[PDB]
Write a protein that binds this ligand. Structure first.
Ligand SMILES: CC(=O)N[C@H]1[C@@H](OP(=O)(O)OP(=O)(O)OC[C@H]2O[C@@H](n3ccc(=O)[nH]c3=O)[C@H](O)[C@@H]2O)O[C@H](CO)[C@@H](O)[C@@H]1O[C@H](C)C(=O)O
Ligand SMILES: CC(=O)N[C@H]1[C@@H](OP(=O)(O)OP(=O)(O)OC[C@H]2O[C@@H](n3ccc(=O)[nH]c3=O)[C@H](O)[C@@H]2O)O[C@H](CO)[C@@H](O)[C@@H]1O[C@H](C)C(=O)O
Ligand SMILES: NC(=O)c1ccc[n+]([C@@H]2O[C@H](COP(=O)([O-])OP(=O)(O)OC[C@H]3O[C@@H](n4cnc5c(N)ncnc54)[C@H](O)[C@@H]3O)[C@@H](O)[C@H]2O)c1
Ligand SMILES: NC(=O)c1ccc[n+]([C@@H]2O[C@H](COP(=O)([O-])OP(=O)(O)OC[C@H]3O[C@@H](n4cnc5c(N)ncnc54)[C@H](O)[C@@H]3O)[C@@H](O)[C@H]2O)c1
Ligand SMILES: [Zn+2]
Ligand SMILES: [Zn+2]
Lengths: 310, 310
């Protein structure tokens, strides 16, 4: 992508910062981010000539004005937490549905060429029909999952009502540089890496045979950019279509870190589904083929990032 | 249902007033209604000893307090318009998602035994797989349809997260006494009846071969009450599972009114789907069998109501 003027909501966050990095040399980029979880220092160059940063909540921003003469909108801003949403459903509704809708209204009023929306495999709930096809019904188990599904439904309705073109991307388990490790809720790869680097035993919730479809953050960024350039409108899973158990993950991370620190086993967390696996056939719709044998290399890059932060 | 204390949101409206009528002799009923479209005079007895009316927007009401010690909540309050939602998606979002969520939060915090939610066959969009089963995916064509679907998804998530029991009822084409005829958007049965009573030719948008699954408002009220009493949680179509063309409807209404006024034919309305038909198998889940040969009787009751309003 070259010579476009794009908006990246949540562009100071984990995933959004990697999208900004990939676009910024050849495109004007306006980030809208309230710093609720993102950081200026997540950007490779936060002073880049092509960059604009608007430090504001989407609910307050004049999105009708900001989106004038923009080409594409990448919507990553969200309160991105399943357990957080259970504790605070109304606040999550404001950030995840209401703000998204305000953005989508400004998109259609400004004739934005495409919206690329960050959804989640959480919308599937506990579905045994793996590998999970996009045609599965929604089975949201948390307010967060209902919110992402609601946004997908609004996008469908905006396509029909106003001709707004969009891709909704259902991410599976994203990992990589700049992912949070500090929250009680933080993802397993950051927790395993952080624990080992701090000389502490990590923990597994359950027996460790649970499995996930992990996908590297730079691949998510590529999928976003390819979706913007595609003529396809609709919903696409973004993953590798491969399973890894948490036991196996721990072995691999321990090998990468040359670590003899052992893992502890605790009871299962309520709400954790046992197995999650994407069907990624529809990645053909955006001409995306993720790298299928680069997990160790990606983990090494992630570890090096966490080392640099100590 | 006897000796319960219930809340009916939108209880001064078309459908809600019939639910209030059916419950009020044997139960305490609190209506919450902002009079945006409902009327005091829709109730059979607006001064009934068991009645309380709170004239307030759901967004402003202290629902946490109002729902203390209530048994059931019937949620009918909404901005109930497909074309209105296209014109004003944010305002419709506030009334249809945000207010519903505030209510559902108060329901789960007060351990309400059941929520009975008014959804719509609009959530199916233009789906040729008739008769339409509840398992069909959502295909919302308007912000309204997305909003009703979002509410259904929130209810599912609240069942999983908090144990809130619910039934979402997908109404097909409701008709009967107290339905609005004055809006530009008003439903076909009121428009046909009102036109003929005013000595004016009604209009058909298209060729009249379009068909709908019409369902009488008193049957909707019964389905609501049976759903409250049922152990079932989930989503159920409420209809007859029968089709009637708009041409045939006009013939029947003209016969009932002994009218020689002819109908005019105009171009199709954008957004109108041609055929809509419910699969009503899952009405067995709430032990409801609607009357299958009472259409003329129901139309006569509707006509007599419109006559009484002249
Ligand atoms: C925090 C995070 O990134 N979570 C994301 C991740 O969930 P989840 O699959 O629950 O991710 P995990 O917590 O990393 O759990 C994955 C597995 O790892 C075990 N585990 C986790 C932590 C630990 O210390 N020990 C341990 O054993 C755990 O029991 C589970 O089996 O993937 C989902 C998509 O597939 C996202 O919806 C979800 O939220 C994102 C933000 C969003 O939607 O915006
Ligand atoms: C106003 C109203 O009650 N509309 C409801 C009705 O829609 P619709 O099926 O569009 O209902 P119609 O407008 O009565 O249209 C039905 C058919 O009749 C023709 N027609 C309509 C008017 C007229 O003058 N002449 C004429 O020919 C028209 O072209 C169509 O084929 O049924 C749906 C459920 O099946 C509801 O979602 C919808 O909104 C409710 C509020 C809600 O969800 O809350
Ligand atoms: N990390 C994952 O595994 C994962 C999986 C599935 C979906 N997602 C989705 O991808 C997107 C990005 O997630 P992430 O992991 O980068 O999360 P993140 O918290 O790092 O990024 C979200 C960014 O949005 C900003 N933000 C939040 N609310 C805002 C508001 N109201 N106005 C303006 N800015 C706001 C935050 O400050 C942050 O920089 C989210 O929509 C998330 O739900 C992530
Ligand atoms: N009429 C139909 O054919 C049909 C079909 C499918 C679904 N529904 C649904 O059934 C329910 C009732 O529809 P109806 O036809 O009786 O509509 P209606 O407009 O007659 O009733 C809605 C009632 O809610 C009140 N209201 C609206 N917004 C409110 C708010 N924010 N706070 C408090 N009160 C509010 C109105 O004053 C009105 O009395 C709605 O949820 C509607 O979407 C109706
Ligand atoms: Zn297993
Ligand atoms: Zn036909």
């Amino acid at each position: 992508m070259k010579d476009k003027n794009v908006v990246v909501t949540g562009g100071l966050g984990f995933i959004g910062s990697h999208i900004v990095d990939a676009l910024i040399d050849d495109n004007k980029v306006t980030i809208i981010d309230n710093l609720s979880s993102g950081k200026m220092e997540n950007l490779n160059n936060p002073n880049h000539e092509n960059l604009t940063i608007i430090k504001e909540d989407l609910m307050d921003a004049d999105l009708e004005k900001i989106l004038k003469d923009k080409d594409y909108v990448f919507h990553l801003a969200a309160l991105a937490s399943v357990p957080g949403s259970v504790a605070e459903p109304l606040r999550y509704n404001q950030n995840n549905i209401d703000a998204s809708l305000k953005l989508f209204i400004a998109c259609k009023n400004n004739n934005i060429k495409k919206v690329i929306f960050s959804s989640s495999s959480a919308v599937y709930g506990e579905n045994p029909n793996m590998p999970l096809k996009e045609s599965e019904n929604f089975l949201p188990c948390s307010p967060y999952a209902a919110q992402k599904a609601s946004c997908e439904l609004y996008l469908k309705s905006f396509h029909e009502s106003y001709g707004l073109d969009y891709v909704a991307l259902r991410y599976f388990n994203v990992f990589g540089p700049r992912q949070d490790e500090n929250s009680p809720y933080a993802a397993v790869i950051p927790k395993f890496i952080s624990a080992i680097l701090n000389g502490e035993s990590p923990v597994i919730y359950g027996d460790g045979e649970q499995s996930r479809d992990f996908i590297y953050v730079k691949e998510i960024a590529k999928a976003n950019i390819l979706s913007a350039e595609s003529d396809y409108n609709g919903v696409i899973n973004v993953a590798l279509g491969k399973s890894m158990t948490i036991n196996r993950l721990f072995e691999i991370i321990s090998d990468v870190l040359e670590s003899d620190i052992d893992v502890k086993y605790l009871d299962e967390r309520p709400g954790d589904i046992k197995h999650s696996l994407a069907d990624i056939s529809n990645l053909d719709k955006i001409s995306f083929k993720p790298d299928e044998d680069k997990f160790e290399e990606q983990l090494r890059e992630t570890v090096k990032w966490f080392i640099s932060q100590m």
